Amino acid sequence: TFGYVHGVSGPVVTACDMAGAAMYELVRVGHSELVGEIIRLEGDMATIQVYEETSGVSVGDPVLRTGKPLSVELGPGIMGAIFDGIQRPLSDISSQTQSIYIPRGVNVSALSRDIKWEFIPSKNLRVGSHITGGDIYGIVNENSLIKHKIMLPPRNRGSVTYIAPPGNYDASDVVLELEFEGVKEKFSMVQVWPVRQVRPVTEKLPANHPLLTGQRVLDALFPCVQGGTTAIPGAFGCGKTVISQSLSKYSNSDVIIYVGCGERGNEMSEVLRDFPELTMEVDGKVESIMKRTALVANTSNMPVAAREASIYTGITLSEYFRDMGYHVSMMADSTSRWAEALREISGRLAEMPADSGYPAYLGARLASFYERAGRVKCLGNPEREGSVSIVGAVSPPGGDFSDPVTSATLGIVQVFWGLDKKLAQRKHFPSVNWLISYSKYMRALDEYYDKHFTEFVPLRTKAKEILQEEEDLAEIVQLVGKASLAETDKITLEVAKLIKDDFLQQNGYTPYDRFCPFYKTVGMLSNMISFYDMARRAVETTAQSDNKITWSIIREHMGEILYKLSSMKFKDPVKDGEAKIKADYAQLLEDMQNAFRSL
Amino acid sequence: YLSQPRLTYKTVSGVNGPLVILDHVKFPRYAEIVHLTLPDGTKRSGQVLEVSGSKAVVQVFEGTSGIDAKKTSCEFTGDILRTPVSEDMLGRVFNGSGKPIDRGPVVLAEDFLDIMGQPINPQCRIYPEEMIQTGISAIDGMNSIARGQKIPIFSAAGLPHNEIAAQICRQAGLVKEENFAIVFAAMGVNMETARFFKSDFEENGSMDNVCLFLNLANDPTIERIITPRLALTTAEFLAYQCEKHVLVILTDMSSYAEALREVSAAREEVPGRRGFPGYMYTDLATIYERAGRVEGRNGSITQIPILTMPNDDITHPIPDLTGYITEGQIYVDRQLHNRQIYPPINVLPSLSRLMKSAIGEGMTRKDHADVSNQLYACYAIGKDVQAMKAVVGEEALTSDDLLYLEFLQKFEKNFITQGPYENRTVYETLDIGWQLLRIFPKEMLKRIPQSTLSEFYP
């Protein structure tokens, strides 16, 4: 049957004559085919949110119904392209229309129906065997960097009847036919999945491997774990987008899905421009990093309703690739934008408001979304171990942490990277407020450091204590000037200041600091702490002597050595061997030892 | 007992959020339980929250999704919800709705008990007087508890309150049966919390005497309304019927509050402070006081719920209302956690009704109250002088001020700072307290009477 457009108001549309409808069913409204979802029923009337700008819609316009809920088409061809809030390849659309603007009711296939794909069936696939879901039954070298696997969709089982031979195949060509109870059914290399349904798993597993970030600050002090979760609040201009870009460029993961919702499209242009040039080395081959990334975008000026759809689509794709046997991370940008969209839709429904005008179920939705993370043993007889990590970014209005959005997110994630506006004002570009930041993955990670970098463990603790002690003095320094403190205090203050100016600071846009390997950070911290304790012990041992070593004497003795220690950060990961920089650090340490003993 | 054939209704006149509005129901009953069939074979359940005329309102436990006005049907039972009850509930785990989450089958309901409980005469209740040893010096001593009391644990996000709960459950015992059975209930937690608690419980081999429930973050929100009451009903049965001394651990009551907010906002009922509905004061009264001994019976109910604290707001509605009901509170502060203190417990805002439980005559020792009070006052003055220190430099302080600062420092370094798995005895903590007292001379013992002072100080 077909409904009719009883009334319109903003992005919401009431439709009569919809007796057979149900919640969360896709619908089409207008003479143009505007996609939407149902959100409220009342007798024969219904309510529809629409993902297109609403204008030029009459009453009584026909409305079509379909029993399919919102879904995404999953398969090859995804990477290297870009999609809208709903699954719609922008590049294909732009080639189709030959214009600048997106048509109001453009409708094109999610994936190409003409590209050909090589195929290799499994070496254990015999006629009459059973796989009962989750088993890979073929391989496709979609791109040189990453090879797409195809597995039986879940909730499927039955004996093998037909197997496609090795070779080339286009979409919708019969790959595998399966017979269970006298019913025959065919599958291709593309399938469908509802967006809001959680993909089943065999079991969730604990985190056991660190996920590096390429920043001296984050890896050293507030590390994140593979398969974990986190959030990054902070006012505008604190460089959240920069951190997201750096993580996407230099992670340890295989595949990265960047979901930008409600931002400038110039960021999308930056991603489109920079990533193709940059290359990364695995398997003895150098490949443009676009092959290992997929991009979902929703510019700010687009209609409000699509934004939730974008956030859901992104995690659905991440899920599909976690099932594939890879570690993947996500860059969820500005989930507060999603909150804003919820606020608007609830506003047009005359629903009772909650704190700060947001709907009541904001917390529930955020918890449900962030729960999907975690390491996973997957379904299937050939066991694989995958994982999903979500690195969310929050944008609290006013720059404080009182809005319900941020407080809600704090109660779910395990790692928290606060940013402070004054620090970014300082041009301390990676503005991380170590004081407020914290991480709850300190445990279940000490084994990794004990197995590789055992010395790092005391070192970081010492640095943290030094930072805290600096803070604990700074207020009394500010209230009352100097010349009222012991030598140890001023020494600790000054070394903490140099830590601040050098170690914490990191300019990722110079060619030589775009990325910092972990061992460089370890060596830097080792040199710093060695110098600190050596100086402190030296001055302490002369406390009761006839010649008390003061800080001015230390400066006169070691100004040039301090200068070299400051310039220590000028070590390019390329064009300079690991061995030579390590030897340079060792030689500097020996110099520090000699200068101390000479005194 | 028997009943007539049940009735099917297909008159779904609307759907709105977690609610479903029907009509043309014949003789609807308030708080009646119903079932729901979907266009597929999937089944659900719910209850009735409102009734008027032939119209009725139906809350759905599993949420709302794909509901139709042409295929979905409804079934009406004949009475309030009544749930399985048996001794076999131990050694088993269940979801938010009490179905078996492990592979074991549906428990055999030796009896059926009303979820809503039933009132008890105040005259037929007995004061709880037996101090329960915990081993934490911050809890034993300053804020001693008894067998039958209830104490919430105020905490904020990012704090290790779960570790504290595990430590308490491990070392629970009596000062001088064998131990307590455990009725644990989770209210919308992530997999980490549940897994950690499971690991802790199986570490001590206490699964033979734990019945546990699980409501995870992925589950439908509405289930949290019913989840804790099941655990409380089961615990009530084990305590007042099997005469077993039980310990019920609730957690994340804020999620319960959120679910209640959902229900109220859906019904467009009059809101109050911060959009919270008015009547959760009554509701929290219902969920909280189900504890304490009774005349002529053995066993007891000790209830330790855990409440997360939005931001750092002591005046927030949820913790404030919980303050008006429970007889105590144990506070957690992020300051101590930043200072690397494994039990980060700010003793100043904490308080309990050890008020006549830890007498000493017959109980542990006679000096208990005096030492507790003197430590409390000295700690308060220590915080005061610490605040004064940030104003004027160290040189302006008198000798007594430095003594207070040193006493404070050594106090958190020794008394508060306790390592995990450390089972301190009450006598040990009293002795530690005395050693801390010895820092000052006897003349600053403004609170200890003469007799105890001359008895122990030398």
């Binding site: 005359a350 009772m352 408001p353 005008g357 | 467009e268 009059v270 809101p271 959009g275």
Partner: peptide, 13 residues
């Protein structure tokens, strides 16, 4: 104020 005004307006029906 906003919440109260909303419920008041709804009270008409």
């Amino acid at each position: 104020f906003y919440r109260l005004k909303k419920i008041q307006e709804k009270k008409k029906i």
